[model samples]
Target: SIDVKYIGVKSAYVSYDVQKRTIYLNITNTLNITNNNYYSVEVENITAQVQFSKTVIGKARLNNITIIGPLDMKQIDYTVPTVIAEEMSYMYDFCTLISIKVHNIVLMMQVTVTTTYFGHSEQISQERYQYVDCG
Candidate 1:
C-alpha cells in the first residue's frame, strides 16, 4: 500500500459545445514535490472526465474522472534542462489532450489530481518556478 496525496490539479481547460454535446479539456501533468519522486507520481485507474450543472452560477452536477500515471521516463522529458521549462512542462503535458462528453455547456469546473508513490526516487533540489502559463 502507498500513500497518495492531492496536490491539486496542475491546470485544466474545458471547451464544451452544447450543440454537439461534446467537451474537451486539456490537463497538464501534475507535480508532487515530496522527499521521493518515484513514490510520489503514481495514479491508478487513471481517467479524466467532467460534468456540469444547471444553475450556471450556484451548485450544479459535478462529475470528474481520475487520471493515473507513474514515474515513467516517457512521461518525463529530462531534455528540458531549464528549471522553469521543466516545471511548466509538467502542467503543459498534463492538460495537452484531455477531452470529455457532456450534455450542456460547462460553466464551472472542479479539478482533482490524485497520485500514489511507492519508494524513494531522485529529489529536486533546485528552486525554480514560473508564474506564466505556457501553451
Candidate 2:
C-alpha cells in the first residue's frame, strides 16, 4: 500500500502587486510518502498545484528516479510557484484593511509510482487545506 501525508507547513507568506491581477504566495510544506509494499518502489513523477477558493493560484512539479525500501518513507519539500494571478486583490485589500487572517488554500499532490511486479504507472493524489497569512 502507498500513502501520502502532509506533515505541516514549514514556511508560508503572502503579498500582492500594488494594482494588478496577480499575487505572490511564498509557501513551503513538508510531506511524507509511505510504502507498505514488501519490495522497493520507484516514484517517477510528481505534480503539485495550489488553489484558493476553487481557483488555481500556482503550481509546481518534479521528476526523478527515486526509490524507497520496503516499509520505508520519503520526505518531499513541496513548494509551489511563487507568482500567480487572481483578481481577488480586492479581497486581499479588504482582508488587509480589516487585519483578518488569510483565507484557506488547497494543495493537490499527485505522483506516479511503479514496482517490479507492476508495470503500469499508478497515480496517487492527495489534497489538503492550508491556512496561511497575508502581509
Candidate 3:
C-alpha cells in the first residue's frame, strides 16, 4: 500500500476583478506520495481544484511523468490557476469591505492523484480546507 499525504498550503493570494467584481483566490499546495512496496511506483496523473461552496474557481493538473522508488517519497507542488469565484460573491460585502478586518472565510480544495503500479491503478482524492480572504 502507498501513502498520500497533504503537506498544507504554501502560499495564497487574493485577486479582485474590477469589471467582474468577483474575487479570486490563487493557491499553491504541497503534497507527498510515499511508496511502501518493494518496487517503484509510477504516477499517471495529478489534478487539483478550488471551490467556493459548490462553484469551482480554479483548476490545475500535473502532466509530467513521476516515479517513486521503493520506501521513498516524492514531493509534488501544484499551483491552481486564478479564476474569479462568482459563487463567493455572496460574501462580497464582507470580504471586500471588512471594516473590522476580523472577517475570514475558507474554501474547499480537492486534490486527486492517480498512480499505477504492478498493473494496478489507484486513484486517491485528498480533501482539505483552505482559509482565505479577499481584500
Candidate 4:
C-alpha cells in the first residue's frame, strides 16, 4: 500500500475584486508520499476542484510534473480563481453592505492523485466552513 500525507498548508489567502466580480484564492501546500513496496511508484496528473457552498467554483492543474522518490516529499502551489455566480452575487453584496459575517458557507476542495499503477488512483477531499466577512 502507498502512504500519502498532507504535510501542511503553507499559505492561504482570499481576495475579491469589486470591478471584476471575482474571488481569488492563493494556496500553497506540501504533501509527501512514501513508496514502501519493492517497486518504484510514479505520480502525475495532479489536479484539484474547488467548491463553495457545495457548488463547484473552479478547477486547477499543476504546472509542473510531480514525482515522488522513495521516501521523499513533494510540495505544490495552487492559485484558483472563482467567478461570483449571478445567484450568489446577492450574498456578497449583502455582506459587504451590512458588514456582517456569513456563516456555514461550506468550502470544499477535492484533489485527485493519479499513479502509474493500475486501479490505484486516489482522491483526497476536505471540507470546512468559515465565517466570511465580505466587507
Candidate 5:
C-alpha cells in the first residue's frame, strides 16, 4: 500500500494590482509519500488541483517518474499559481469586505506509484485545506 499525506503549506502570499485588475498568489505546498511495501516504488505521475469551495482555481503537474527506496518516505514540493483575473472585481469586493485573503481553500493531489517487483500500480489521493492571504 502507498500512503500520501499533506504535510502543510510552507508559504503563501498574494498581491493584487488594482490598475490591472489582477490577483496573484505565490504558494508552496509540502507533501509526504510513504511506501508500505518491502520493495522500492516508482512514482509515475503526479497531478494537483487547487479549489476554492467547489470551484477549481488552478492545476499543477509534477516532474517525471522517480524512484523511492523501500519502506521510505519522500517529501515533494509543489508551487501553485493561484491567480484571479477574469473575476477580479467580484473577488476584490469580497476580499476588501471580509479579508484580503482566500479562506478555507481545498487542495487535492493525485499520484500514481508503481512497484516493479509485482508490476502493481497504486493511485493515491490526498486533500487539505488552507487559508491564503492575497492582499
Candidate 6:
C-alpha cells in the first residue's frame, strides 16, 4: 500500500459586523491548518464557505496563507465543501488586539473520503484571526 499525505489550508471564510466592526474568521474545520505530524499528504483538496453576520463594513478578506507555504492548487478539488455558520458581536474602538467569546455554537462536519491506497485519514482544526497583537 502506498502512503498518501494530505496537508495545507483547504479554504476559509470570514464575516465581519459592520456596526461593531468586528471580524470572525470562520475556518471550515476541514482545512486542518495546524502544524503537526498528521499532515504529510500533498493536500488533495480544500473547500470553504463564508457569510456575514451583521453586514460587514470591511473591504474583503486577505487570505494571507501564501506567505508561509505554497498554496498547492494542483492537488485541490474545487467542489465547494460547506459553510459553517457563526456570529460575533463586540465593539472595538481603538484597540490593536481583539478577543472573541464563543458560546452555544453547533459546529459539525461529515467527510466521506475514498482513498486509493490504504492510507489513514486524520483531521485537524484551527482558528486563524487577522490581527496584530501588540503588548
| lDDT (Cα, tens digit) per residue for candidate 6, span 11-125 | 3344322456667566444444445555454554547645434645577676754443333356755464555455785655565433445444444444334323433455454
> For model 1, what is the alpha-carbon lDDT of residue 41?
45
lDDT of 2 by residue, 1-135 (tens): 455566565433343225567575775656666757565667556566444334353675757968764545579465545555777464334343323345445443333353224235455555675444655
- Candidate 3 residues lying further than 4 Å off, grouped into runs, are 9-37, 40-92, 96-121, 131-135
Measure candidate 2: CA RMSD.
Answer: 27.0
User: What is each predicted model's overall lDDT from 0 to 1?
Assistant: 0.44, 0.50, 0.50, 0.50, 0.51, 0.47
List runs of model 4 lying over 4 Å from the truth. Answer: 10-37, 40-93, 96-123, 126-133
lDDT of 3 by residue, 9-90 (tens): 5433343224576665675657665756465667556476444434354676657868654435469565646455665356
**Lowest summed lDDT over 10 consecutive residues: which window, candidate 4?**
110-119
lDDT of 5 by residue, 8-71 (tens): 6543334322456566568566766574747566755647644443535468675796876454
TM-score of each: 0.12, 0.17, 0.18, 0.16, 0.16, 0.13
- Pairs that collide in candidate 4 are none
State, as a TM-score between 0 and 1, how close model 6 is to the true structure: 0.13
Per-residue C-alpha lDDT of model 4 across residues 1-135, encoded as one tens digit per residue: 466445455433343224576665685657665646475677556577444434353685657876654534469555556565565444524553333345544443332443233335445554554546564
lDDT of 1: 0.44
Better of 1 and 3 by lDDT: 3
Which one wins on lDDT?
5
Worst 10 residues of 6 by lDDT: 110-119
Q: After superposition, how far is residue 40 of candidate 4 from its true place, in Å?
A: 7.2
Superior by TM-score: candidate 2 or candidate 5? 2
Q: Where's the lowest-lDDT run of ten residues in candidate 5? A: 9-18
